[PDB]
């Protein structure tokens, strides 16, 4: 490809040159034209010193980036831009939060790689639709749970074992297999069921306080950080939140259409005739998003602004609620829609 040419010959742009605001929480990675994002991945890893630290071969890494990028389909939400903006938020965590005092470098490295790979080959439909619609993935995976996530992992593994893409094949067998373990745990942790299982443990962790010598704290923190990244679109301003809803509901309603055409009734939120958006968004923000970011703040006080921004985005939903009632006449002055 021609993308492959340019990445392999031009050089790794330093990070400041992408945007003077690039390492800030107020930065919106979705502003970056899709065509610059593989480059940026490279700059982020460079700026974290990983390329030098773990002695990664540059061409192999370039090839791996591109494979990961094209292993994403194009549903409205779960596409390469989602994956890039989740990896970018992992980068901010390392730059802003000083994870190094809580995590080994190999763990931080794995989180970042996992971020890029965590939704590989997503089709825009969720775990219950896979079962509900008895697909090959459910066939493969459904008896162990997390259908989509096991598929994401499996695709990551398939890219790694593609000639010239194995950015880890020079690690010791000990480090190589630690790296596969960590990616499997982290990708699996992106299922909301997983997160709901470990919630008390996370609360406990923040309650007793973080213990650097407790291996299980390392594991739990890794899971919290992955869910932080995966929800990071809710940490920017109202403009991002609104646009994120458009893309998320377009995907849910599409799946809902397909559930109706197969002869099931979709859940409310996936049904475009019943889904009432402000209320679903407010529920999501209150029950899932806010608690994840409150936990982040409990363990790294410099993460407080993330939480208040999420809270603040939930407030806007409430403020615009009323606009989903047609008062007066519709713009075209006709009750045509009513028929």
Q: In the structure encoding, which two tokens stand for residue 254, read together? A: 């599409």
- Nearest distance, CB of residue 214 and ligand 7Y4, angstroms: 23
Q: Which is nearer to ligand 7Y4, 68 or 225 (CB)?
A: 225
Q: Which of 104-112, 150-158, 226-234, 299-307 is the region at the interface with ligand 7Y4 (rule: CB under 6 A)?
A: 226-234
Q: Is 230 annotated as a binding-site member? A: yes
- Using CB under 6 A as the binding criterion, the count of chain residues that bind ligand 7Y4 stands at 12
Instruction: Return the residue of 47, 230, 233, 259 that touches Zn ion, per CB under 5 A.
Output: 230
Name residues contacting ligand 7Y4, limited to 288-307 (CB under 6 A): 288
Q: Which is nearer to ligand 7Y4, 43 or 190 (CB)?
A: 190
Closest CA to 155 of 187, 111, 110, 117: 117
Instruction: Return the residue of 223, 231, 295, 299 that touches ligand 7Y4, per CB under 6 A.
Output: 231
184 binds, among Mg ion, ligand 7Y4, Zn ion, none (CB under 5 to 8 A by kind): none
Q: Is 316 annotated as a binding-site member? A: no
Q: Is 169 annotated as a binding-site member? A: no
Contacts of 128 by beta carbon, 8 Å cutoff, 6+ apart: none
- Nearest distance, CB of residue 74 and Mg ion, angstroms: 15
Q: What is the DSSP string of 149-216?
A: HHHHHHHHHHHHTSTT--TTTTS-HHHHHHHHHHHHHHHHTTSHHHHHHHHHHHHHHHHH---TT-HH
Q: Which of 116-124, 176-184, 261-269, 297-305 is the region at the interface with Zn ion (rule: CB under 5 A)?
A: 116-124
The answer to the question of residue 119 lying near ligand 7Y4 (CB under 6 A) is: no
Question: Torsion over CA of 165, 220, 44 and 116, rounded to 10 degrees?
Answer: 40
Set 78, 151, 152, 217: catalytic member: 78
- Residues 162 and 153: their CA atoms lie apart, in Å, by 15
The answer to the question of residue 248 lying near ligand 7Y4 (CB under 6 A) is: yes
- From the number of C-beta atoms within 10 Å of its C-beta (0-12, 13-18, 19+), residue 329 rates as exposed
Q: For the chain, percent helix, then strand, then coil, each to nearest 5?
A: 70, 0, 30
Q: Which is nearer to Zn ion, 243 or 265 (CB)?
A: 243
Q: Is 336 annotated as a binding-site member? A: no
Side-chain-side CA neighbours of 323 within 13 Å: the count stands at: 7
**Has 78 been annotated as catalytic?**
yes
The answer to the question of residue 234 lying near ligand 7Y4 (CB under 6 A) is: yes
Closest CA to 114 of 29, 226, 235: 226
Phi-psi region of 334 (alpha: psi -120 to 50; beta: other; left: phi over 0): beta
129 binds, among Mg ion, Zn ion, ligand 7Y4, none (CB under 5 to 8 A by kind): none
The answer to the question of residue 146 lying near ligand 7Y4 (CB under 6 A) is: no
Q: Which residues are catalytic?
A: 78
Binding residues for Mg(2+): 119
Binding residues for Zn ion, per CB under 5 A?
119, 230
Binding residues for ligand 7Y4, per CB under 6 A?
190, 192, 195, 227, 230-231, 233-234, 244, 248, 284, 288
């Amino acid at each position: 490809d021609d993308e492959y040419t340019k990445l392999l010959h031009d050089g790794i742009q330093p990070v400041a040159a992408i945007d003077s605001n690039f390492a800030s929480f107020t930065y919106t990675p979705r502003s970056l034209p899709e065509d610059d994002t593989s480059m940026a991945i490279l700059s982020m890893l460079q700026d974290m010193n990983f390329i030098n630290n773990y002695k990664i071969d540059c061409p192999t890494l370039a090839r791996f980036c591109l494979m990961v990028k094209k292993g994403y389909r194009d549903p409205p939400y779960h596409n390469w831009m989602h994956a890039f903006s989740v990896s970018h938020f992992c980068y901010l965590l390392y730059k802003n939060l000083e994870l190094t005092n809580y995590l080994e470098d190999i763990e931080i490295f794995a989180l970042f790689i996992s971020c890029m790979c965590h939704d590989l080959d997503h089709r825009g439909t969720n775990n219950s639709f896979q079962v509900a619609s008895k697909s090959v993935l459910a066939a493969l995976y459904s008896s162990e749970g997390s259908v989509m996530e096991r598929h994401h992992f499996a695709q990551a593994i398939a890219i790694l074992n593609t000639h010239g893409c194995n950015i880890f094949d020079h690690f010791s067998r000990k480090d190589y297999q630690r790296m596969l373990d960590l990616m499997r745990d982290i990708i699996l942790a992106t299922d909301l069921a997983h997160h709901l299982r470990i919630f008390k443990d996370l609360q406990k962790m923040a309650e007793v306080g973080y213990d650097r010598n407790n291996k299980q704290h390392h594991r739990l923190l890794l899971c919290l950080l992955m869910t932080s990244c995966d929800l990071s679109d809710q940490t920017k301003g109202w403009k991002t939140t609104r646009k994120i809803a458009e893309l998320i509901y377009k995907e849910f309603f599409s799946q809902g259409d397909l559930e109706k055409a197969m002869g099931n009734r979709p859940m409310e939120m996936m049904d475009r005739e019943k889904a009432y958006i402000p209320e679903l968004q407010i529920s999501f923000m209150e029950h899932i998003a806010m608690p994840i970011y409150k936990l982040l703040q409990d363990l790294f006080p410099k993460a407080a602004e993330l939480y208040e921004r999420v809270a603040s985005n939930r407030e806007h939903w409430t403020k615009v609620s009323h606009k989903f009632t047609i008062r007066g006449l519709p713009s075209n002055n006709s009750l045509d829609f009513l028929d």
